[PDB]
């Protein structure tokens, strides 16, 4: 159902909350009364509507079939290229992933997308990442790899990855420090 | 001077002594004997007794009138037949 503001805009008038509730209850009674199309269109006048796009497969000079995508996390931006056929090799900035990511947590984060759809060792990945720290770069590469791999898994697997959070871009970024307080939220020591 | 075990006597039924005691207590309450027993512990002065009796009569009349009014108006409490108008 449209909100009270939408109803007021439609009727170019001002209505109270109780009037809106009365009208909504009347509309619900109309819907539950096995109303025909002549009334279903009337209902749809007051109805308001509430999937991830996938990049297409491309081809390179070498003849391999691949997809390319990108992602970001905090202040790090990464671009990933995933080939349809590979051997699990991932090279970040021209460096092998186990050398560019000595931390095991980052390597686990990189493994997470392919492991979720059960495709470890079935692809080859080349990533270019810039900015942020080790974990931000790992997260950006993870998001880019998942977005690119969406071009090779089935739609059901795409929906499963979306439900697993592999495709949502993490909006959590550093909050700015404000004047009069130590940090983003840390106030100064309240004297007495 | 009266015969014993006739007044305020309740026979127990299949040994439910608790139930028999509750029945006897209810009988005493309904007959007002408990009220008299507890109010005769201390002397209630006649003016206080008259005030209490008048207040009790007024409260009973008011409660009966309120209950009758609520019962009479309860019929209107049905579902709204003219919803939207």
3-state secondary structure chain A: CCCHHHHHHHHCCCCCHHHHHHHHHHHHHHHHCCCCHHHHHHHHHCCCCCCCCCCCCEECCCCCEEEEEEEEECCEEEEEEEECCCCCCEEECCEEHHHHCCCHHHHHHHHHHHHHCCCCCCCCEEEEEECCCHHHHHHHHHHHHHHHHCCCCCHHHHHHHHHCCCCCCCCCCCCCCCCCECCCCCECCCCC
Chain B residues whose CB is inside 8 A of the A22 CB are 84
CA distance B81 to chain A (A): 12
- Taking chain B, what is the end-to-end CA distance rounded to the nearest angstrom? 76
Query: B45 — alpha (psi -120 to 50), left (phi > 0) or beta?
Result: beta
- CA geometry: angle B3, B6, B10, nearest 5 deg: 155
Experimental determination approach used: cryo-EM
Distances from the Cα of B82 to the Cα of A34, A39, A53, A79, A130, angstroms: 19, 19, 50, 64, 68
Backbone angles phi, psi at A9, to 5 degrees: -65, -40
Chain A residues whose CB is inside 8 A of the B84 CB are 22, 26, 29
Who's near B18: CB < 8 A, 6+ residues apart?
none
Chain A residues whose CB is inside 8 A of the B82 CB are none
| B82: closest chain A residue by CA | A26
Sole residue written with tokens 């007794």: B49
Chain A residues whose CB is inside 8 A of the B83 CB are 25-26, 29
Q: And the tokens for A127?
A: 């990533």
Who's near B4: CB < 8 A, 6+ residues apart?
none
Residue B83 contacts A where some CB pair is shorter than 8 Å: yes
CA distance A26 to chain B (A): 6
Backbone angles phi, psi at A92, to 5 degrees: -105, 120
- CA geometry: angle A13, A14, A20, nearest 5 deg: 105
> How many CB atoms neighbour CB B33 within 10 A?
13
Residue B85 contacts A where some CB pair is shorter than 8 Å: no
Distances from the Cα of B40 to the Cα of B32, B33, B34, B37, angstroms: 12, 11, 10, 5
Distances from the Cα of B28 to the Cα of B32, B37, B52, B60, angstroms: 6, 10, 21, 21
Who's near A46: CB < 8 A, 6+ residues apart?
A1, A2, A7, A10, A27
Give the Cα separation of A3 and A43 in Å (integer). 14
Resolution (A): 3.0
Instruction: Report yes or no: A147 and A71 within 8 Å, Cβ to Cβ.
Output: yes
CA distance A186 to chain B (A): 54
Give the Cα separation of A21 and A27 in Å (integer). 10
Q: Of A89, A65, A23, give the one whose Cα is nearest residue B85.
A: A23
A9 CB-side CA count, 13 A: 7
Instruction: Report yes or no: A162 and A52 within 8 Å, Cβ to Cβ.
Output: yes
Instruction: Provide the 3-class DSSP secondary structure of residue B26.
Output: helix
Chain B residues whose CB is inside 8 A of the A29 CB are 83-84
**A residues 21..80 contacting B (CB < 8 A):** 22, 25-26, 29
Please tell me what DSSP assigns to residue B76: G
| B83: closest chain A residue by CA | A26
């Amino acid at each position: 159902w449209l909100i009270k503001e939408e109803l007021e805009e439609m009727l170019v008038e001002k209505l109270s909350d109780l009037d809106y509730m009365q009208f909504i209850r009347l509309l619900e009674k109309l819907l539950t009364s096995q109303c025909g199309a002549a009334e279903e269109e009337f209902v749809q006048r007051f109805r308001r509507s509430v999937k991830q796009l996938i990049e297409p497969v491309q081809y390179d000079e070498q003849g391999m079939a691949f997809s390319k995508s990108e992602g970001k996390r905090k202040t790090a931006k990464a671009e990933a290229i995933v080939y349809k056929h590979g051997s699990g090799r991932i090279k970040v900035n021209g460096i092998d992933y186990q050398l560019y990511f000595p931390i095991t947590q980052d390597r686990e984060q990189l493994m997470f997308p392919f492991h979720f759809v059960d495709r470890l060792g079935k692809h080859d990945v080349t990533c270019t990442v810039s900015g942020g720290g080790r974990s931000a770069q790992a997260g950006a590469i993870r998001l880019a790899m998942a977005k690119a791999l969406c071009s090779f898994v089935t739609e059901d697997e795409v929906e499963w990855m979306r439900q697993a959070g592999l495709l949502t871009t993490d909006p959590r970024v550093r909050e700015r420090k404000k004047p009069g307080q130590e940090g983003a939220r840390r106030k100064f020591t309240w004297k007495k | 001077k009266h015969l014993k075990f006739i007044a305020r006597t309740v026979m127990v039924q299949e040994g439910n002594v608790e139930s028999a005691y509750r029945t006897l207590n209810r009988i005493l309450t309904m007959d007002g004997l408990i009220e008299d027993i507890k109010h005769r512990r201390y002397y209630e002065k006649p003016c206080r007794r008259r005030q209490r009796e008048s207040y009790e009569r007024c409260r009973r009349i008011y409660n009966m009138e309120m209950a009758r009014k609520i019962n009479f108006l309860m019929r209107k409490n049905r579902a709204d037949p003219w919803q939207g108008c």
